């Protein structure tokens, strides 16, 4: 019955359609636009959550912490390229020391 | 006689044209009456300031023709105008003459 089940998606297509209609972007919205946008959102959130789960597993943790999200974002070239101008609250910084500063 | 809103408000910029562009530029269903007048006044002030500084900079160059060079000189030599127009490149504007102090010989 739901458009999400027809499109094989978990994100609500109707919610995206309503946000596009009442968001003052254009006069009319096609039927394929919310489905496409929901699929893109689901793929991106699945990718970042997959990398966050991998980072949490590597850190021997069971709950994802914003530290793990920061690590997952900063260890991925495409994601941190996309999210260059984003600062994650309570995320810290990536551990990096310069080669020439290490002691001798 | 149907007097223009620009003449009613004492402006040179077209109030009707900016009103139409605001109404047609997909912002909000309805547009207040004072917003096109205010926007046209702001645009007038900004173009007056820019054209004034450009005409002055041309006057130091002993020229009667305003070129992109004078516009670039007027924009980059004013602190607040440089702050506002920071991330724009003026076509055929050139670069301000700037030589570093320690770059020079002794």
């Amino acid at each position: 019955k739901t458009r999400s089940s027809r499109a094989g998606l978990q994100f609500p297509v109707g919610r995206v359609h309503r946000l596009l209609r009442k968001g003052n972007y254009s006069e009319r919205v096609g039927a394929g636009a919310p489905v496409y946008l929901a699929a893109v959102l689901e793929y991106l959130t699945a990718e970042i959550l997959e990398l966050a789960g991998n980072a949490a597993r590597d850190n021997k943790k069971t709950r994802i912490i914003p530290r793990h999200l920061q690590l997952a974002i900063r260890n991925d070239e495409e994601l941190n390229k996309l999210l260059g101008r984003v600062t994650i609250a309570q995320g810290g910084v990536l551990p990096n020391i310069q080669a020439v500063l290490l002691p001798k | 006689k149907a007097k223009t809103r620009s003449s009613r408000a004492g402006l040179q910029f077209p109030v009707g044209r900016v009103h139409r562009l605001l109404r047609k530029g997909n912002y909000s269903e309805r547009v207040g009456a004072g917003a096109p007048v205010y926007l046209a006044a702001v645009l007038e002030y900004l173009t007056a300031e820019i054209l004034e500084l450009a005409g002055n900079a041309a006057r130091d160059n002993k020229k009667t023709r305003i070129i992109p060079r004078h516009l670039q000189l007027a924009i980059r030599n004013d602190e607040e105008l440089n702050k506002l127009l920071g991330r724009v490149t003026i076509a055929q504007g050139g670069v301000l003459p700037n030589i570093q102090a320690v770059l020079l010989p002794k």
Partner: protein, 93 residues
């Protein structure tokens, strides 16, 4: 009151990719902000494309080209493929 969030759907995709992994509330807010930001970027750029070509309708095409415009590299290609597959699966159902 009635505040909207993407909590349930993020929970579903999380249990899809990691059934045994949980997530904190601060991370949930971070995910909601991320989804809202990406949604705003793609929808606004699609509207801008519609404005450029003197068109009044947002279809799958302008959304697709906005996805190629914003996302960098392989990401954009896989997102375009996934969206196209979702569109034809919806159209054939």
């Amino acid at each position: 009151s009635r505040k909207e969030s993407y909590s349930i759907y993020v929970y579903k995709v999380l249990k899809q990719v990691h059934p045994d992994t949980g997530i904190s509330s601060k991370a949930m807010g971070i995910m909601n902000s991320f989804v809202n930001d990406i949604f705003e970027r793609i929808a606004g750029e699609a509207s801008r494309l519609a404005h450029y070509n003197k068109r009044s309708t947002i279809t799958s095409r302008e959304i697709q080209t906005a996805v190629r415009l914003l996302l960098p590299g392989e990401l954009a290609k896989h997102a375009v493929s996934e969206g196209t597959k979702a569109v034809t699966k919806y159209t054939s159902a």
